[PDB]
């Protein structure tokens, strides 16, 4: 009759009750008619099944007429149909247990551990909100440093669903790049999580950057890493950079400005292995604002040519759109307009303005 889905390793309780609110003889048996457990008077007799260790019941509820079956540390092989048997009639409850696990061959792989004969579909939403839908196995092909939060995968079989949450951590100096898109005036955050092997190890590093003008490459800061302690060697006055003393390599820019935009290289070396490690970082900045009757929206930094800028009212359609670096509207209709720099599928930057 009943249908229960479970998380692998979690604990679920199967509710059986009888009409008479008294202690009476009963037992449980699985799909193969194997005794799970029974009661002999006051005592509880254990069944011969391979579920012997984990399956259990609560004797507190036997007087009240409830006869629950408790299974802790669920396994996929536990998923089966179970039967509560009081000598008069039998109540039937079907159990499916799923599980989610993460492999790694930069790139990540997820496998959904499933019981036999199931027909499940699995959608998965990123921390930023990107949805990745798949079948029994999902593949996270390309990862950027920004999208490294707690991911949430919801698994659905027919009409019943189960939620899984798992963390993704993207290593900095691997081939994955870092990029941040900010509207003007916002504080900028860059994080470079270190691999657990080198986190204790010691080295030195610095960050080179290039602005709107390519005349000079500023080389913002030089810093030293000993034990798990980050100390700064030199900082430029121009960006008021903050380097975290704490071990997670954290760098903060006080507020985003157009001049503070462009590609950069962060280089970390280590006295141990003396092999130069590099990492690529980009910052793209949007300015969307109205001067008197004019409305102007420009974007600065290294953006792929393929993306497109648009100005549009949220009620109507795009009043102007080009794939260039700057967009301007004169005497625009009254309303709350918006400026978007976006690729084909998603909007990278959106700014909301009032005319």
């Amino acid at each position: 009759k009943k249908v229960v889905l479970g998380k692998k390793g979690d604990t679920v309780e199967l509710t059986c009750t009888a009409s008479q609110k008294k202690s009476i003889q009963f037992h449980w048996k699985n799909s193969n008619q194997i005794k799970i457990l029974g009661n002999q008077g006051s005592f509880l007799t254990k069944g011969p099944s391979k579920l012997n260790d984990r399956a259990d019941s609560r004797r507190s509820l036997w007087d009240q007429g409830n006869f629950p079956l408790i299974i802790k540390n669920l396994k996929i092989e536990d998923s089966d149909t179970y039967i509560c048997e009081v000598e008069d009639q039998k109540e039937e409850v079907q159990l499916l247990v799923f599980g989610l696990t993460a492999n790694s061959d930069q790139s990540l792989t997820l496998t959904l551990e499933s019981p036999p004969g199931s027909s499940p579909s699995v959608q998965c939403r990123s921390p930023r909100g990107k949805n990745i839908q798949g079948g029994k196995t999902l593949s996270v092909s390309q990862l950027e440093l920004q999208d490294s939060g707690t991911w949430t995968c919801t698994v659905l079989q027919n009409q019943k669903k189960v939620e899984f949450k798992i963390d993704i951590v993207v290593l900095a100096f691997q081939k994955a790049s870092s990029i941040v898109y900010k509207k003007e005036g916002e504080q900028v955050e860059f994080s470079f999580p270190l691999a657990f092997t080198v986190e204790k190890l010691t080295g030195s590093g610095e960050l080179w950057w290039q602005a709107e003008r390519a005349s000079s490459s500023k080389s913002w800061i030089t810093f030293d890493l000993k034990n798990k302690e980050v100390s700064v060697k030199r900082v430029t006055q121009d960006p008021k950079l903050q380097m975290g003393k704490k071990l997670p390599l954290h760098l903060t820019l006080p507020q985003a400005l157009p001049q503070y935009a462009g590609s950069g290289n962060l280089t970390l070396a280590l006295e141990a292995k003396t092999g130069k490690l590099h990492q690529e970082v980009n910052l793209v900045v949007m300015r969307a604002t109205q001067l008197q009757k004019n409305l102007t929206c420009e974007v600065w930094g290294p953006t792929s040519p393929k993306l497109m800028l648009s100005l549009k009212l949220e009620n109507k359609e795009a009043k102007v759109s080009k794939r260039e670096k700057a967009v301007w509207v004169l005497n625009p209709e009254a309303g709350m307009w918006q400026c978007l720099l976006s690729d084909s599928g998603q909007v990278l930057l959106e700014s909301n303005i009032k005319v």
């Epitope: 699985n30 799909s31 079907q94 004969g117 839908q133």
Partner: antibody, heavy 122, light 113 residues
Framework: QVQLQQSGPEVVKPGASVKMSCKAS????????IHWVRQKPGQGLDWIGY????????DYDEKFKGKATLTSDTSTSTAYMELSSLRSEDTAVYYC???????????????WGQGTLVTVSS | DIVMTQSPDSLAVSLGERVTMNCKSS????????????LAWYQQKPGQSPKLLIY???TRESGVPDRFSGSGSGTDFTLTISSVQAEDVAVYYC????????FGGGTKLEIKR
């Protein structure tokens, strides 16, 4: 009396996509999983994919990971499948089927459609 | 995937005789918990769609007559037609539902008169 009725035969240009249909009647359309099978002329059955009508959940076989697209219209109670960039080989007969019961109790294809013949030609 | 293989290519059987049709799977289809084989058998008479014959590898559908019987366990399964009637000229397929859903190549049963 559970019926499964598919489209009629069709002609589709090479490279064009064919969207075919499968109309269900006699049960709660969102309560059981739908499957698609391809059979080429006088050849074995090739499993393609399965769609859950409840949320339009999707999983396909690797051979058809690009080609096969399964959607369902819950109101009309119909399941569709479309193949993209049809090739000469792809001329075949496609069936839609249903699981006997839900939640792994019955996963064998018990109720079947009549078949749709798509002649890939110009 | 799970590779299913059906032998023979085609079969010639005389009237009233006993039919044996084999389906061997890549990996096992037996589920340890509920001791059920996740395998099924199907008939397709010419010009028609396939028809369900055996589910769980040991049980037949209500419409199915009594002469068909399913046998085997694990990885080696067999369909047996007790006495071939003239009307059983068809091609029979086997399918697994343990993981995903894969079929066989097929055995054509032809009667020798």
């Amino acid at each position: 009396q559970v019926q499964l009725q598919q489209s009629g035969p069709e002609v589709v240009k090479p490279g064009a996509s064919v969207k075919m249909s499968c109309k269900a009647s006699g049960y709660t359309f969102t309560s059981y999983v739908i499957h698609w099978v391809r059979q080429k002329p006088g050849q074995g059955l090739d499993w393609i994919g399965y769609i859950n009508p409840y949320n339009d959940g999707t999983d396909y076989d690797e051979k058809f990971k690009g080609k096969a697209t399964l959607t369902s219209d819950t109101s009309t109670s119909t399941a569709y499948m479309e193949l993209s960039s049809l090739r000469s080989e792809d001329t075949a007969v496609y069936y839609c089927a249903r699981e006997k019961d839900n939640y792994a109790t019955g996963a064998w294809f018990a109720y079947w459609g009549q078949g749709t013949l798509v002649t890939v030609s110009s | 995937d799970i590779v299913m293989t059906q032998s023979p290519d085609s079969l010639a059987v005389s009237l009233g005789e006993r039919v044996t049709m084999n389906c061997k799977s890549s990996q096992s289809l037996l589920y340890s918990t509920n001791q059920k084989n996740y395998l099924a058998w199907y008939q397709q008479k010419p010009g028609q769609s396939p028809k369900l014959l055996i589910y769980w590898a040991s049980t037949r559908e209500s419409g199915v007559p009594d002469r068909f019987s399913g046998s085997g366990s694990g990885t080696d399964f067999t369909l047996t037609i007790s006495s071939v009637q003239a009307e059983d000229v068809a091609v029979y397929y086997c399918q697994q539902y343990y993981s995903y859903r894969t079929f066989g190549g097929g055995t054509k049963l032809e009667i020798k008169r």
